C-alpha cells in the first residue's frame, strides 16, 4: 500500500473499552469523612459522556478499600483483546498519591499497577486513562487577577 504513519492509537477495535466509574459519596462513620455532595451529578454526567463515546460504562458506588482493589484486579484480569482502550474514573476524597475507599485509603499505584504493560497483556500498547477527582494535598491557589 501507500505510505503509512503510526502516530495515533488504533481506536477501531470492536469495542472502545470499559469505563469504570468509582463514585464514593458516603463514607463509614468511623472514618469521620464527610459525604461528598454533588458527586452523583459527576457520576451521571460521566456515564452519559462516555456512553456517547461508546464506552461500556460500569458504575460502582461507595466501595471500601478492599472492594476497590478487588474490582481493579478483576477488571485487569478480563480479556480486553477486542477493546481499544481502558478508562477508570475515581471520585472520592484523596491526598497526594491516594484515593479513599469508604473505610480508608488506597494507594493509586496499587490500582494502576494492575494495568501495567506486563500485568494486563490484553491492554499492552493500548491507552489506559485514569481520571481522578480528589484532592492531592492541602495547598490553596489564591489566583492572580488578569
Q: Using CA atoms, how far apart are residues 42 and 31, in angstroms rounded to an integer?
A: 23
Q: Which is nearer to other proteins, 66 or 117 (CB)?
A: 117
Q: Using CA atoms, how far apart are residues 53 and 1, in angstroms rounded to an integer?
A: 30
Query: Which region among 43-51, 59-67, 72-80 touches other proteins (by CB under 8 A)?
Result: 43-51
4 binds other proteins (CB under 8 A): no
Query: Which region among 60-68, 72-80, 113-121 touches other proteins (by CB under 8 A)?
Result: 113-121
Query: What nine digits make up the cell of 45?
Result: 454526567
Q: Using CA atoms, how far apart are residues 132 and 88, in angstroms rounded to an integer?
A: 8
Q: Which of 26, 28, 45, 77: binder of other proteins (CB under 8 A)?
A: 45
Buried b (16+ CB within 10 A) or exposed e, 39-51: beebbeebbeebe
93 is a catalytic site residue: yes
3 binds other proteins (CB under 8 A): no
CA triple 112-42-15, angle to 5 deg: 55
The binding site for other proteins (CB under 8 A) comprises 6-9, 11-12, 16, 34, 36-39, 41-42, 45-46, 48-49, 52-53, 85, 89, 91-94, 96, 112, 115-119, 123-143
Active site residues: 93, 135
Amino acid at each position: 500500500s501507500g505510505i503509512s504513519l503510526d502516530n495515533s492509537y488504533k481506536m477501531d477495535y470492536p469495542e472502545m473499552g470499559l469505563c469504570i466509574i468509582i463514585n464514593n459519596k458516603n463514607f463509614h462513620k468511623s472514618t469521620g469523612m464527610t459525604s461528598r455532595s454533588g458527586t452523583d451529578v459527576d457520576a451521571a454526567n460521566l456515564r452519559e459522556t462516555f456512553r456517547n463515546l461508546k464506552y461500556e460504562v460500569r458504575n460502582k458506588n461507595d466501595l471500601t478499600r478492599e472492594e476497590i482493589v478487588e474490582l481493579m484486579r478483576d477488571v485487569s484480569k478480563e480479556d480486553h483483546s477486542k477493546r481499544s482502550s481502558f478508562v477508570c474514573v475515581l471520585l472520592s476524597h484523596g491526598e497526594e498519591g491516594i484515593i479513599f475507599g469508604t473505610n480508608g485509603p488506597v494507594d493509586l499505584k496499587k490500582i494502576t499497577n494492575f494495568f501495567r504493560g506486563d500485568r494486563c497483556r490484553s491492554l499492552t500498547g493500548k491507552p489506559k486513562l485514569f481520571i481522578i477527582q480528589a484532592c492531592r494535598g492541602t495547598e490553596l491557589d489564591c489566583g492572580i487577577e488578569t
